[PDB]
Design an enzyme around this catalytic site. Structure first.
Site, mmCIF file in Angstrom:
data_model
loop_
_atom_site.group_PDB
_atom_site.id
_atom_site.type_symbol
_atom_site.label_atom_id
_atom_site.label_comp_id
_atom_site.label_asym_id
_atom_site.label_seq_id
_atom_site.Cartn_x
_atom_site.Cartn_y
_atom_site.Cartn_z
ATOM 1 N N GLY A 278 0.806 -1.210 0.000
ATOM 2 C CA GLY A 278 0.000 0.000 0.000
ATOM 3 C C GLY A 278 0.840 1.262 0.000
ATOM 4 O O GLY A 278 0.467 2.268 -0.609
ATOM 5 N N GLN A 279 1.983 1.229 0.684
ATOM 6 C CA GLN A 279 2.888 2.371 0.704
ATOM 7 C C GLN A 279 3.493 2.575 -0.678
ATOM 8 O O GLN A 279 4.391 1.831 -1.085
ATOM 9 C CB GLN A 279 3.990 2.169 1.747
ATOM 10 N N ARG A 280 3.008 3.580 -1.406
ATOM 11 C CA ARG A 280 3.442 3.837 -2.771
ATOM 12 C C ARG A 280 4.566 4.861 -2.851
ATOM 13 O O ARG A 280 4.997 5.208 -3.954
ATOM 14 C CB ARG A 280 2.256 4.296 -3.622
#
Lengths: 50, 51, 214
Positions: free
Chosen positions: C73-75
């Site tokens: 999720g951490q882009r």
């Protein structure tokens, strides 16, 4: 009277001294080979300092 | 070696009973009894040569 | 002591807080942390049937607690948040065997994660998900779809062996890591057991390395 003890020059004393010297040489060779290949997995598996 | 291999605990970082140089201390502790006995023997009744 | 009464009471409060910190730390120590990675279609969300910030999952099998973190999720740039996961037991990489482009950027991600400057002493549990479905698909069509340079017969054995050999050959830090590859069945019941075995093995290796016996 004759004085009796174990002697440095009687044959049995020579044999015992020779065996002790052979043992010293064998252990010295073992230590030398251990130090030469000190950084190897079989040597590291056995505690090197001990 | 046995203590290292057996312990299943994920947190085995604790090394207050094994590792480092405590092993030398344990060896000296084991030999301390013999040192003490030798000292007492040589102070209370030394062996000597006899004819 | 040269303290007053209030000073002694404050010291007592501090000691109580210290005790609580000790118990909490010892409790948190009894856990295993895993870094769950892979493509979105890999099936990482369904890896263990026992079950916007970081995705967290927790399960206990055979007296061992496991916290799996998914950080896809951490882009943002991974360089400035990947060092927060350096103190984890293992990286669990799931690959989608059927989809071809998916498995391609899966190799990309595998190489990127394995060649980091932080994960130089951590190992990968590689789950080759979608085993039999991709087996039938490879019966239908060859592995030339993505592994075009690869030459092999239409049998599933050669294609699967080549894919596993590839995914293990992108590795470069073979000196201080070991990949555990598992063919993931649709109804596989050994997943938790395999994770347990891998974690136990890597923890034993860690003891061996710190004690210098390895």
């Amino acid at each position: 009277k004759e004085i009796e003890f174990l002697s440095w020059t009687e044959p049995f004393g020579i044999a015992l001294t020779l065996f002790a010297v052979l043992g010293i040489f064998l252990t010295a060779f073992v230590l030398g080979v251990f130090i030469k290949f000190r950084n190897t997995p079989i040597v590291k598996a056995t505690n090197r300092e001990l | 070696v046995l203590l290292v291999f057996e312990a299943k605990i994920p947190t085995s970082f604790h090394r207050k009973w094994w590792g480092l140089n405590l092993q030398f201390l344990l060896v000296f502790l084991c030999t301390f009894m013999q040192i003490v006995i030798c000292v007492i023997w040589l102070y209370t009744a030394p062996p000597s040569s006899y004819r | 002591c040269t303290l007053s009464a209030e000073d002694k009471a404050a010291v007592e409060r501090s000691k109580m807080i210290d005790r609580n910190l000790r118990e909490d730390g010892e409790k948190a120590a009894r856990e295993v942390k895993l870094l769950l990675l892979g493509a979105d279609n890999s099936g990482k969300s369904t890896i263990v049937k026992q079950m916007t910030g970081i995705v967290e999952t927790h399960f206990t099998f055979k007296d061992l607690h496991f916290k799996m973190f998914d950080v896809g999720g951490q882009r943002s740039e991974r360089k400035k948040w990947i060092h927060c996961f350096e103190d984890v037991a293992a990286i669990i990489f799931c690959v989608d065997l059927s989809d071809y482009n998916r498995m391609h950027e899966s190799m990309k991600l595998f190489d990127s994660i394995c060649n980091n400057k932080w994960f130089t002493d951590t190992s990968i549990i590689l789950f080759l998900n979608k085993k039999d479905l991709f087996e039938e698909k490879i019966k239908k069509s060859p592995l030339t779809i993505c592994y075009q340079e690869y030459a092999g017969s239409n049998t599933y054995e050669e294609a699967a062996a080549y894919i596993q050999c590839q995914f293990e050959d992108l590795n470069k830090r073979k000196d201080t890591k070991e990949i555990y590859t598992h063919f993931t069945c649709a109804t596989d019941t050994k997943n938790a057991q395999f994770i347990f075995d891998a974690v136990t093995d890597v923890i034993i290796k860690n003891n061996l390395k710190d004690c210098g016996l390895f």
